[PDB]
Design a binder for this molecule. Structure first.
Ligand SMILES: [Cl-]
Ligand SMILES: [Cl-]
Ligand SMILES: [Zn+2]
Ligand SMILES: [Zn+2]
Ligand SMILES: [Zn+2]
Ligand SMILES: [Zn+2]
Lengths: 369, 369
């Protein structure tokens, strides 16, 4: 709807968890090209950012949880460094359309120049190993938001989803030092994936507001990956925010009825995409729809307020629902917010204001020391 | 001379020590632009690579020797990682004219496609600190040639020029392990800057041929930075080679008669360049000339043979002589070699064949284990 795009276009938009960097190392993949989620599996690229009115976001440096050993740590360090480098290479290859942002002023300046701004975030800090000086290493290369853990516990903190249960009851002693270093450098702490203990300790100990880069409310869907109302409010009352995820909102159990993207031939990739597409069409996956996404956002808005909510759909990280396939559908969020009675001020806060405020606060504290 | 360029153009050329990366971080500096050594201080860029017929080379990740402390090592690690990243950014910004090479096949393939090939080398391995796993970290980002030390001794080995003398009498115990790791990964060991003890131990212990990325013969000029005939032959007899340097060939003592390039204003840089130029014109520095460069090359050729000699002039690292100001003068080397009676086969070996053979051997050993 051109009417929706017009309204949407008036706001500075950003998503706090673009997993798109996972595609950067794919042979011949170019963010400048237009892709189809059905054929490429990607949900983000420049053409679609323009079509969906997405002005920028936090490009994720993500790594799955591996061994808590010296070999695991060295592997993780190198892997994350390389993923960070891939992001910097994308930016170096697209200077006229993209630019790295380190501060909120950078974001606004880049936006005014007509370019997409790219902040850098980390999902799973397993890569720092036992050497916290690596946090600054990543900071020097652009890191401005980081979560200590992913799906399983690591040397820094407990995950909300580890099948083996808790081991630290929040942050490990090393993790507490990690939190202190993130605060000192001015990196926004991301609790998405972390256990409730980590959330509680983060709010209690962090010198700056924290964030949940991609989470939801247990009130809408009871899953460890979501937060109860009390914690949503706690994060918000401390100046933080929760960015709305598009998954963990419904039972995805499938009805009774992949190649290495970094080395597979373009034909091979097309092959699986085609088979997959047919399967998804014959027996659609249970993902919920756009109304469900707004149901989640609206509930968090009620509990955390318009200043404690943001957008983090998990694009390229498994996100997506019926009527919310990729970023081209983002304008629908702005439409529903208006239709729900939210002012432009609140919509602006939700699309970027709240996140940029959190970034400012984190970096303000860092400067103060 | 178009006649010289025609001959020169027939060979695949590469220099083993392009310090050019030191300019990559300079504000607005672009390798695609044409520069004048007199105004920009640079001796390498795409236009001049084309004019001089330089097909590629090893782009250096260099760092001066600092403190042998935890603080020094973390600083060195981060610095070298950033310099490596700057090189990768240059490559990402110039995909149609440049491409990173990891193997000799890459070099030839890239050359055939009409692009300049860029290998990555390290000068001073101080950045690995006490953590040898970092060697692989750099390897994963492109490192294929590395020297353990620079002007002063470090935690890995003795330098040939440290004013305080020797401390390890070659490699330290950590340095021996470093040599073993370089061999295991398939990184070519570079002894330029290392003490004679390091040279002797490298030939005796290395599982693969080694190289002197930019050195000369003591026979022509007696300086610690050059090698005696016995060591030249030793390196060659082990399958290695010595790449001819353009400095340390004459007494540079000046007759009786600079801003931060990364932060100075284009005008300020021009200012110094102009003053400097006038000074260099009024009272030329003692640098020798092109004949002296060939005198060095010819002597090493006599001792090491046509299979143990290569080119490493120290461009952007202090190299240059009268009649050999920058890479536009490279064709003169090919002319003199012919004029001296060397076949095309030998000239080809000297310009790239020998180096690529050494790279192949290093990587062949790595694969074998
Ligand atoms: Cl997730
Ligand atoms: Cl030198
Ligand atoms: Zn993710
Ligand atoms: Zn996630
Ligand atoms: Zn150098
Ligand atoms: Zn040097």
């Amino acid at each position: 709807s051109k009417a929706d795009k017009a309204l949407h276009d008036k706001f500075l938009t950003l998503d706090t968890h673009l997993d798109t960097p996972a595609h950067f190392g794919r042979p011949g993949w170019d963010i400048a090209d237009h892709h189809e989620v059905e054929h490429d599996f990607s949900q983000v690229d420049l053409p679609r950012m323009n079509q969906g009115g997405l002005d920028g976001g936090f490009f994720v440096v993500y790594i799955g949880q591996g061994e808590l050993t010296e070999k695991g740590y060295t592997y993780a360090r190198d892997y994350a460094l390389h993923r960070t480098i891939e992001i910097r290479e994308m930016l170096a290859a697209n200077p006229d359309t993209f630019e790295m942002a380190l501060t909120s002023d950078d974001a606004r300046r880049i936006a005014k120049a007509g370019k997409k701004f790219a902040f850098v975030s980390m999902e799973n800090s397993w890569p720092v190993g036992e050497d916290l000086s690596l946090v600054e290493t990543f900071y020097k290369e652009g890191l401005r938001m980081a979560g200590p853990v992913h799906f399983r516990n690591n040397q820094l903190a407990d995950s909300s989803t580890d099948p083996k249960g808790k081991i630290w009851n929040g942050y490990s002693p090393l993790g507490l030092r990690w939190l202190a270093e993130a605060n000192r450098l001015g990196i926004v702490i991301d609790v998405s994936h972390a256990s409730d203990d980590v959330v509680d300790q983060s709010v209690a100990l962090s010198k700056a507001p924290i964030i949940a880069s991609h989470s939801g409310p247990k009130a809408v869907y009871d899953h460890p990956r979501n937060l109860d109302d009390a914690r949503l409010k706690k994060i918000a009352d401390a100046g933080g925010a929760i960015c709305i995820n598009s998954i963990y909102l419904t039972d995805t159990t499938p009805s009774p009825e992949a190649p290495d993207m970094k080395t597979a031939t373009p034909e091979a990739v097309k092959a699986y995409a085609d088979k997959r597409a047919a399967i998804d069409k014959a027996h659609p996956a249970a993902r919920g729809d756009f109304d469900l996404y707004m149901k989640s956002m609206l509930h968090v808005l009620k509990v955390a307020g318009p200043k404690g909510v943001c957008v983090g759909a998990d694009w390229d990280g498994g996100g997506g629902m019926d009527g919310f396939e990729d970023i081209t559908d983002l304008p629908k969020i702005t439409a529903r917010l208006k239709a729900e009675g939210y002012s432009d001020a609140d919509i602006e806060a939700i699309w970027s204001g709240n996140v940029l405020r959190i970034v400012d606060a984190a970096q303000a504290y860092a400067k103060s020391v």
